[PDB]
From a paper:
To understand the determinants of RNA cap modification and help guide the development of SARS-CoV-2 antiviral therapies, we have now succeeded in solving the high-resolution structure (to 1.8 Å resolution) of SARS-CoV-2 nsp16/nsp10 in complex with the methyl donor (SAM) and its target, RNA cap me7GopppA1. Even though SAM was not included in co-crystallization or soaking experiments, its electron density was unambiguously identified in the difference maps (see methods section). The binding of the Cap-0 substrate results in an ~180° outward rotation of gate loops 1 and 2 from their positions in the binary structure displacing them by 7 Å and 5.2 Å, respectively. The resultant widening of the pocket allows accommodation of the RNA cap substrate, and engages the N7-methyl guanosine base of Cap-0 (me7Go) in a deep groove formed by residues of gate loop 1 on one side and gate loop 2 on the other. Gln28 and Asn29 (gate loop 1) orient outward, whereas the side chain of invariant Tyr30 rotates inward, thereby forming a cleft to stabilize the purine ring of me7Go through a π-π stacking interaction. In gate loop 2, Asn138 rotates outward and the side chain of the invariant Lys137 rotates ~180° inward and forms stabilizing electrostatic interactions with all 3 phosphates of the Cap-0 structure and the 3′-O of the me7Go ribose. The methyl group of SAM is positioned 3 Å from the 2′-OH of A1, available for a direct in-line attack from the 2′-OH. Thus, in our ternary complex structure, Lys170 best matches the one activating the 2′-OH in other viral 2′-O MTases (e.g., Lys180 of dengue virus NS5, and Lys175 of vaccinia virus VP39), and likely serves as a general base during 2′-O methyl transfer in SARS-CoV-2. Unexpectedly, we observed electron density on the opposite face of nsp16, >25 Å away from the catalytic pocket, that was consistent with adenosine, that we had included in our crystallization mixture. Thus, the lack of extensive interactions for adenosine and its high temperature factors (compared to RNA cap analogue and SAM) suggest that this pocket is probably not specific for adenosine but could accommodate other small molecules with a heterocyclic ring.
Nsp16 forms an obligatory complex with nsp10 to efficiently convert client mRNA species from the Cap-0 (me7GopppA1) to the Cap-1 form (me7GopppA1m), by methylating the ribose 2′-O of the first nucleotide (usually adenosine in CoVs) of the nascent mRNA using SAM (S-adenosyl methionine) as the methyl donor. While both Cap-0 and Cap-1 forms promote the recruitment of the host translation factor eIF4E, the Cap-0 form favors the binding of interferon-induced proteins with tetratricopeptide repeats 1 (IFIT1) to viral RNAs9. Nsp16 adopts a canonical S-adenosyl methionine (SAM)-dependent methyltransferase (SAM-MTase) protein fold, with slight variations. Nsp10 is a 139 amino-acid long zinc-binding protein that stimulates the enzymatic activity of nsp16.
Residue numbers in the entry:
A (entry chain AAA): 1 to 298
B (entry chain BBB): 18 to 131
The structure:
Amino acid sequence: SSQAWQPGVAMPNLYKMQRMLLEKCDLQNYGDSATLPKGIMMNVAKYTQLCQYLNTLTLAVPYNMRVIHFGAGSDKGVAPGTAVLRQWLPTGTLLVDSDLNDFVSDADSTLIGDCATVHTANKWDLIISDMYDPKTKNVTKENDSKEGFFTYICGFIQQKLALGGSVAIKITEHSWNADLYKLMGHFAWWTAFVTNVNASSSEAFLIGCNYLGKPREQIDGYVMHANYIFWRNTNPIQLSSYSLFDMSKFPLKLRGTAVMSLKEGQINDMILSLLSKGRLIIRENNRVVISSDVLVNN
Amino acid sequence: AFAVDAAKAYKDYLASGGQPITNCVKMLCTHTGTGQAITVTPEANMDQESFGGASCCLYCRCHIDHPNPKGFCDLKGKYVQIPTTCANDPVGFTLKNTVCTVCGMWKGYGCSCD
Ligand SMILES: C[n+]1cn([C@@H]2O[C@H](COP(=O)(O)OP(=O)(O)OP(=O)(O)OC[C@H]3O[C@@H](n4cnc5c(N)ncnc54)[C@H](O)[C@@H]3O)[C@@H](O)[C@H]2O)c2nc(N)[nH]c(=O)c21
Ligand SMILES: C[S@@+](CC[C@H](N)C(=O)[O-])C[C@H]1O[C@@H](n2cnc3c(N)ncnc32)[C@H](O)[C@@H]1O
Ligand SMILES: Nc1ncnc2c1ncn2[C@@H]1O[C@H](CO)[C@@H](O)[C@H]1O
Ligand SMILES: [Zn+2]
Ligand SMILES: [Zn+2]
């Protein structure tokens, strides 16, 4: 009802609990476009609504927060979503972005190359991915779980996301991965979030809120993607730009969340409860050092 | 002594009726900000638009060296406020205009020290 005044719509809990078979996604409003404010790019609007929704969750926000953003380049050669993330995040937050193709960015550091080439010494408090393979468009066969950059993202989260950290990873009807839904069960909570400005697309951000580093819930990713599509198929979302007009409470709250080093041995129920509530980040607090592997040939 | 002069070439291109650089990244904001020129977060007032700084920098956009002993960029990682009446060409506005060293407003579009 009041849905059109929200930044978007999160998949309701009851849909996550279903056991649906995967069907073709057929949206009532497919192809329709929101009316954006004058001179605002779709990707600025979309990232603004994602950050507006992330403001409602218990994200951990330490001093010297570290955020990495994959799929940050555009066909325009600039990085609108990075500009939004930099606007939203506390001043001084270290933001690294990356894409296959060259682009100009406001991030503190940018790596150009296939995501599989990206390595980082440090862990991260927030991972955002907008990666999407143009070839996903060439649908021949049945819609099966995809590998490619999703394989990398799953490994990257498990190896490099701090406990208590969060993720938002873009999926669509055909661009999705079963193991990534499975990994949503390793967070204190998760959802699939659809921006109101892009409500006519099967796009969603799969959001994992406060990473626990082990399964809290066993999720079957084939079934969960089917549940997501069933929700989309049966719940038309009205395109809306409304939330773009009120930016007065936009910046992420500076919570100053504690960061601690803890070994495998010391993560008990007490610690898991703090991680779960967005009150703790566990990782080293050394320098941030990243690199991209370069294949040399002739 | 040879050096590409991107700044002049762009001024020359504009003067002969060329279309300004597009795809400067305009931010959503309150438009109730300080109105200063180059800031850590969008600060547009009612008379301005805020843009992602890298996207409004000629040197960043043309993939060329920034013109100064160490290749430092004034705009990248920051937000630039552009008067609405000039927001059709943010790159040209930043090229042609100067920031007041004292109050941080644009000379001629906000700075009132003189
Ligand atoms: C959801 N859906 C999918 N299809 C069909 O299935 C194909 C693959 O479906 P998809 O997984 O790509 O999802 P969808 O079409 O909803 O994605 P969309 O184009 O809205 O793209 C979502 C986001 O992905 C990114 N993206 C899309 N194309 C590109 C690209 N070429 N390059 C980079 N990013 C891209 C952008 O971020 C974009 O906003 C579609 O191209 C279409 O033939 C549909 N057909 C009907 N008739 N009705 C539907 O509801 C429907
Ligand atoms: C929808 S576009 C990103 C738009 C961008 N987030 C913005 O803010 O406008 C998807 C991006 O994912 C990138 N991408 C796709 N597969 C990738 C991969 N394997 N490695 C790195 N980037 C990849 C593309 O090059 C492309 O620029
Ligand atoms: N991590 C979270 N941060 C904030 N609100 C949450 C979170 N998890 C769940 N919610 C709320 O509880 C519901 C799922 O429990 C959501 O639909 C919302 O009402
Ligand atoms: Zn520059
Ligand atoms: Zn002045």
